[PDB]
Design a protein around this ligand. Structure first.
Ligand SMILES: [Zn+2]
Ligand SMILES: [Zn+2]
Lengths: 254, 115, 65, 148
């Protein structure tokens, strides 16, 4: 009537992704962790844009929407930030937001690429990830783009720009020993990269007592967070959600 | 124009209870937990944890509508064990599990970084 | 119009790869080789660069105001 | 008590018409201590059954080996001594038909009792004397154990 004793084995760790394996766990917990990776890890992304002057071929909403998807290095600064609506400031402050300013005037006879390099933050710890660089817009001669922006804490459930992951590969039972999926012709199906079957075999023998365990993860970071940090913040956030629900339930019972 | 603001899937407007408990009169020792501003993230994991308790006779959850952010969890236990007690025990076990997993994941990262 | 910042499906950054992609095509790469050189494995990401049309170049021919 | 029927059978065909379901097979079985024909749909995936296998079969009104009624509700926390511990494959169904060779003037000598375990169909044909415990729309348990 109690918790499992889950175990971790990291099979690969780079700056782009972490690949690991969780054993001795329910499928629901593993899927919830996989889901929290996408929807509930808070990062910093541009969410307030004031355009002082735009002469580009792209209208203002296009530029703002593109700026929102710029990923920002939010490794440690995100934890000490607060959500803006929770912050008591007069709408903005260094404790709930990070200011950006962009001012690019193409006064030359060559197409000026306005990239992420031109985004200038008021905080050195929160820069564009590429700072090759993400192209915001291209400008002709005599075209100015001048705006300020603010980037705030949020998570991917609200909007996909706060999604830190760039694809979360998730798997379990690579040889289909549980027959949670039924191949009409198992011969035709290529082996998973985690399969332990020899090539003369196409499918592990059926396991009547099996249960899903040994879930294989490959979490790729878009760049806002290191993948280690993505997984750790995900587990911390899910634990925080469960503890808050525990507090509310204790209040409701009392 | 009828698009809801995106924040009304995890934020409680004023006068809204996060979680509400209602006795189920059809069967003895049965309760319905209606949790607002939650989804399958907590519903599925809590249901799976509750199913591991031997004293839980029934544990299920539903989202009554994908555009409405309620989850209803029905829990029925044996008649010596309140469903509320089972629910609290399930959450405590999940929290202990996730804390253990955090610790082991930090250790695994340190070992992989060191070599 | 212009290259999207993110792949629509997986959310991988693909906006900083258009210029490099074109550069690799001027290096006489096959388009598969160029996409591999830029580290785009999932065909969701490969679809982005492989099917993008950079219409903004045509729009910068017209005078500003 | 509460055992409506008991025998030992041997399988003479696993599926004579070719399998129509990948997990369920239609065993055709014969009884050696009597003359009872059995047709039985078995979930072979969890309980594989080979041709020529022998097994004890028991058709019971209840499981608690006291005559106490079962209530027809799943109680995993049941503590009573159950007959299911003595067997490998236990299904629970409802007899839905009892055919016979009765004429308009005589009683049936041969009876054929049909039981449906959630859809898995069983026919048990044989002498009427062995099948008097059956009665249509009565819940019943099929317990089964393969013998060496
Ligand atoms: Zn503030
Ligand atoms: Zn992609």
């Amino acid at each position: 009537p109690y918790a499992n004793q889950p175990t971790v084995r990291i099979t690969e760790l780079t700056d782009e992704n972490v690949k690991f394996i969780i054993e001795n766990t329910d499928l629901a917990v593993a899927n919830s962790i996989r889901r929290v990776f996408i929807a509930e890890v808070p990062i910093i992304a541009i969410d307030w844009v004031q355009i002082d002057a735009n002469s580009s071929v792209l209208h203002d909403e296009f530029i703002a929407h593109r700026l929102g998807l710029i990923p920002l290095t939010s490794d440690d600064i995100v934890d000490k930030l607060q959500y803006s609506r929770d912050c008591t400031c007069e709408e903005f402050c260094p404790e709930c937001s990070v200011e950006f300013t962009l001012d690019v005037r193409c006064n030359e006879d060559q197409t000026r690429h306005v990239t992420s390099r031109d985004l200038i933050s008021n905080s050195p710890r929160v820069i564009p990830v590429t700072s090759d660089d993400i192209l915001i817009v291209k400008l002709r001669k005599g075209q100015e783009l001048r705006l300020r922006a603010y980037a705030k804490k949020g998570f991917g459930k609200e909007h996909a720009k706060w999604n830190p992951t760039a694809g979360v590969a998730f798997e379990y039972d690579p040889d289909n020993a549980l027959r949670h999926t039924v191949y009409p012709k198992p011969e035709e199906w290529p082996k998973s990269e985690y399969s332990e079957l020899d090539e003369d075999e196409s499918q592990a023998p059926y396991d009547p007592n099996g249960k899903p365990e040994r879930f294989y993860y490959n979490v790729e970071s878009c760049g806002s967070l290191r993948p280690e940090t993505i997984v750790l913040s995900a587990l911390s956030g899910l634990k925080k959600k469960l503890s808050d629900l525990q507090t509310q339930l204790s209040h409701e019972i009392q | 124009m009828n698009a809801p603001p995106a924040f009304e899937s995890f934020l409680l407007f004023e006068g809204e209870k996060k979680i509400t408990i209602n006795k189920d009169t059809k069967v003895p020792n049965a309760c319905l937990f209606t949790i607002n501003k939650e989804d399958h993230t907590l519903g599925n994991i809590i249901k799976s944890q509750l199913l591991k308790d031997p004293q839980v006779l029934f544990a299920g959850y539903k989202v009554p509508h994908p555009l409405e952010h309620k989850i209803i969890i029905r829990v029925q236990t044996t008649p010596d064990y309140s469903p509320q007690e089972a629910f609290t025990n399930a959450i405590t076990d999940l929290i202990s599990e996730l804390s253990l997993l955090e610790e082991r994941f930090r250790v695994a990262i340190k070992d992989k970084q060191e070599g | 119009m212009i290259i999207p910042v993110r792949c629509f499906t997986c959310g991988k950054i693909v906006g900083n790869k258009w210029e490099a992609y074109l550069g690799l095509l001027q290096a006489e790469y096959t388009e598969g080789d160029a996409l591999d050189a830029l580290g785009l494995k999932r065909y969701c990401c490969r679809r982005m660069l492989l099917a993008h049309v950079d219409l903004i170049e045509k729009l910068l021919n017209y005078a500003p105001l | 008590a509460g055992i409506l029927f008991e025998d030992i059978f041997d399988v003479k065909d696993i599926d004579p018409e070719g399998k129509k379901f990948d997990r369920v097979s239609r065993l055709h079985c014969e009884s050696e201590s009597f003359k009872m024909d059995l047709i039985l749909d078995v979930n072979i995936q969890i309980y594989p059954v080979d041709l020529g296998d022998k097994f004890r079969l028991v058709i019971a009104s209840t499981l608690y080996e006291d005559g106490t009624l079962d209530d027809g509700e799943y109680n995993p926390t049941d503590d009573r001594p159950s007959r299911a511990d003595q067997f490998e494959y236990v299904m629970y169904g409802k007899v839905y038909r009892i055919e016979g060779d009765e004429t308009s003037t005589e009683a049936a000598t041969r009876l054929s009792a049909y039981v449906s375990y959630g859809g898995l169909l069983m026919r048990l044909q044989g002498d009427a004397n062995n099948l008097h415990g059956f009665e249509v729309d009565s819940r019943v348990y099929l317990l089964m154990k393969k013998l060496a």
